[PDB]
Amino acid sequence: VRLVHKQDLQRPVPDWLRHLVLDRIAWILCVRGLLQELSSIRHFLEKRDEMREVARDWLRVGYVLDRLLFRIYLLAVLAYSITLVTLWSIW
Amino acid sequence: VRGLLQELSSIRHF
Amino acid sequence: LEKRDEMREVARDWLRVGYVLDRLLFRIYLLAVLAYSITLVTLWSI
Numbered sequence: 001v002r003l004v005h006k007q008d009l010q011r012p013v014p015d016w017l018r019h020l021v022l023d024r025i026a027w028i029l030c031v032r033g034l035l036q037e038l039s040s041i042r043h044f045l046e047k048r049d050e051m052r053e054v055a056r057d058w059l060r061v062g063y064v065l066d067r068l069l070f071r072i073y074l075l076a077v078l079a080y081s082i083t084l085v086t087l088w089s090i091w
Numbered sequence: 092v093r094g095l096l097q098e099l100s101s102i103r104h105f
Numbered sequence: 106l107e108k109r110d111e112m113r114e115v116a117r118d119w120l121r122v123g124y125v126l127d128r129l130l131f132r133i134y135l136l137a138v139l140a141y142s143i144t145l146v147t148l149w150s151i
Contacts, residue, residue, distance in 0.1 A: 038099065
């Protein structure tokens with residue numbers, strides 16, 4: 001939940017983008033001055049849109065990691081349980 | 092000729 | 106548009122300040138807990 005969020009900061013690092021969104025994803029899957037105004041409006045629009053896209057990528061990373069860790073936790077619980085019942089059986 | 096259309100197209104796009 | 110964008114930037118700066126302070130105070134609190142704990146165990150041993 002710290003990974004995926006809208007904090008208006010940063011960008012997903014490529015080094016850990018390949019490690020998660022690429023490798024771990026496959027591993028888990030298996031004359032008038034009117035123009036100067038429009039330019040500024042467009043500027044504000046893409047200014048927001050950019051941060052939205054960054055937040056989208058971080059959302060991707062966070063989701064992949066969350067799913068993988070979910071698999072790990074589930075398997076851990078099942079293993080702990082099977083050890084529990086084998087101990088129940090031996091007594 | 093004015094380049095206002097290339098701006099409006101982008102705004103509409105977003 | 107810029108009326109909102111400006112306030113957004115201001116909120117961003119306050120977010121920066123708040124985050125820095127929060128991290129620093131996190132360091133302080135953590136070290137305080139560790140020190141209190143080491144005093145606890147040094148008392149436990151004696």
